[model samples]
Target: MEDEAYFIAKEILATERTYLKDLEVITVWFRSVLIKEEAMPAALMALLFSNIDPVYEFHRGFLHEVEQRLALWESSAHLKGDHQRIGDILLRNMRQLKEFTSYFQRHDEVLTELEKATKHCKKLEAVYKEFELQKVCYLPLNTFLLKPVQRLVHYRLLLSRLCAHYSPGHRDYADCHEALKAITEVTTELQQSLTRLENLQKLTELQRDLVGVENLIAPGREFIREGCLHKLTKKGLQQRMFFLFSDMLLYTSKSVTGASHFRIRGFLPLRGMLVEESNEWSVLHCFTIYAAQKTIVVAASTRLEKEKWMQDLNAAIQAAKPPVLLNTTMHVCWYRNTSVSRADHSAAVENQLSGYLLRKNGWQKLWVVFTNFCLFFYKTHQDDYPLASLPLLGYSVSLPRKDYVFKLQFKSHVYFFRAESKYTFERWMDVIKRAS
Candidate 1:
């Protein structure tokens, strides 16, 4: 029982450390760089960091408390009854965290304003991109904005695990259960809003990556999926980027030069749209979509990919209105010669994992955040942005006869990551396998 309590407390401490480092990415690293450069707009900066600062400050103190409690527990010293359990610390902080609910609620507005401001303000955009290049911002900047909300989910999950591991009669169980309830209530309250914010963030990201497309962020237009496919164009078989939205389907062709942007070649409104698996198209894994007056014949890399896309397209067209779509697929197929379907997109969303990675030199430590079919590498979890990104679209994840290690390979590009525990290794395998 003592061991169980220690393990749960240690889990809280470990996650709290990671969470604090993530918070510092904004409050410390990002803010300091922007302040030095004098590049971020004052208004935008205030709106963006004002809410985050309080949360960051609160977590800093909260982390200290958790660390002290864990240290005391680890010391094996006799203490008062209250000092033994972590639940008291969690309970107090969970209640205090509720004070920042309004701030969390306002994050969507902050994100939206930031997006608009960055688009119109070149300095801000440059600052934004430059910060992204930094080692700390492992995921997309907007992704960290969603972390405050996502943290609630993590809290709920961890607390539930703690509660399950303890007996009902255990002293810690009661407080852990109560803390879980408190966090669950907050999560329930924020779930819908969080979902909407995530969808908006995905749209904002797509708007930035996609080129020659106007009004890609239309109201009520939800992003379904984006990927590469071979389209049967008038010039014969040509590769194109396809973006599926609730109200429309768009396909693009890339420029021949080194510019990394897609050119919108066709837009097919979902209304009066028809899709069907077609063998007459002279391509394997082929599907034809008849949208108003135009027809598109496209092929997926696999039969499953074709089916998933066809299902999503048909379902979106038949729905009375746009559904809230969450996962935004990066069109990595063109660059990596890979393809992802709706199922892969859904898996990618649910399979995001944060852990450490060993560089090829096997000495440097990298904190990695994997999502959206990409692995973002940071020097440490404390950094504000990522040093590098590896798109895992065409990659394969395999255990190369090595114990407790897995390799990610795409052509000649290979990387290895070692997990600290068997459970974490399995968790990474589960997600990376599905994502790759």
Candidate 2:
């Protein structure tokens, strides 16, 4: 057997095969439908296809080149020939892929615009519903939109390993080093938008999920965080969900009907707002907020939760409006009795995950997005909104009860999830434990 670099080099080809095919579901497969039916708006196509068509075509070309290069790289028959090393091919292509820097930057725009058009219009939704219903669409259309940016990270990871495998004096070392530099530079250039793009996507979802808000989607209204708290009301400490944004704070009462949506109970703007630890209130982990002459006191589930909320609120007040809205583990943390920490949001990028899970809906699998420490579940990836969410903030990630199954428990409540493969199972554990 050859060294690890050989396997690393081949992984590029293997994933490129799947990656290009994923692109195909959008560029080729969906393109044919729009052209044949003429049901889609030309403007949207111009936005979506114009950005992706070239990238898809570029990947196809890159895929074929990798195929040819991998074909020869595997052959010991070409002892000293250039064909024996894939790094040269990667270096060549990585240098050439600079044409796509500007091209890739606009992909987030395409994803947003496409989701909006699809969501708002019935005709577009009908077309997409059928497209998604098809067997060829392995994951959500939204997920496909995220792949190019996601793929950049994969390239960065693979090339990092490839560079690690080669010694400085090896013949292929220079090429691999140069190739990694080229690709890393590409990832670096396009790196800034992924977080904002994700935030934008999350904002979009929050707007849709809330009941009473129409203008909640205001421009520059950055979402800070959301979680459960017990506000001190006349009826005693009652559970509520709090949503923090750049402009304001909104609290909501959860549905008694068992719906996930929340009803807007009240809102307080951050401008001129004063918040402090409340010694006056006898409750544990209690904090008081003053807006104008009015005062409201709330209790967090723990001292850590109280601190996280106070620090964030203080920072936001220093940085700071008005609000009207209605809006998870903003359900689970109430049950689990905890909340998200200061850097919990920052930690999510390093532990990104999206896939299927079981043991929740009987024996059936659900499309799950383990985003920002909240488990967003969907009946299928094609489904637009998550059915529910569980914040794994203070839970314990149990050692596996079975091969593919792991338990997350807090207090008396427990959840079991089943992953597909050994590596995926391990991956889920590591990420979940870090999250916990």
Q: Write the per-residue lDDT of candidate 2 for residues 1-436, one digit (tens) a residue.
A: 2446665565577457657766888887888877876767899889888888878877888888887877776545546466667777778878888787887788778867876786678787788778876656645566577778777777777778777657866677888888888988988888777656656655666665566765675557788878788888887888887888887887776447776546766678887899978754644889999976567899988788888898999999899823453413344555655555335655654455566778653666886766557777777755544677776767788764445788888778788888766655766777777776
- The pairs that clash in candidate 2 are 328-331, 329-332
RMSD of each predicted structure? 4.1, 6.2
lDDT of 2 at 210: 64
Number of the predicted model whose lDDT against the real structure is largest: 1
Q: Please, what is the TM-score per model?
A: 0.84, 0.70
| Cα-lDDT of candidate 1 | 0.75
Displacement of residue 22 (Cα, Å) in model 2 is 5.8
lDDT of each: 0.75, 0.72
Deviation in Å, model 2, residue 208 alpha carbon: 1.2
